[PDB]
Amino acid sequence: LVAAYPIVGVGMEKLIISTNEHASTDQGKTVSRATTNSKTESNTAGVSV
Amino acid sequence: ANVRYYNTGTAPMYKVTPTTNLVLDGDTLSTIKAQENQIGNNLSPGDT
């Protein structure tokens, strides 16, 4: 008169999350050297009284 | 992970597939059913 029957169900214990990023670090160094030359030429003229 | 099985009792068992479970501190990382790689063909009793 009674029935043969299962009843199941779940229950959560814990929930874990996780993120999604993208990190990076950069480091650099710079070395440089230069040189310069020049040759100029000029003229002047004037009058006083 | 590196792991070996064992057996105890009376009977052998063919085509074994264990389902394993990992735990760090209260949490659960993963539970894996064995794939075709780590399947085991035979286990004579009292062996590994």
From TrEMBL, chain A:
The superkingdom listed in its UniProt entry is Bacteria
Q: Which residues form a coiled coil?
A: none
* Name the record gives this protein: ADP-ribosyltransferase binding component
* Phylogenetic classification of the source organism: Bacteria, Bacillati, Bacillota, Clostridia, Peptostreptococcales
Q: Which residues of the full protein are shown?
A: 293 to 341 of 876
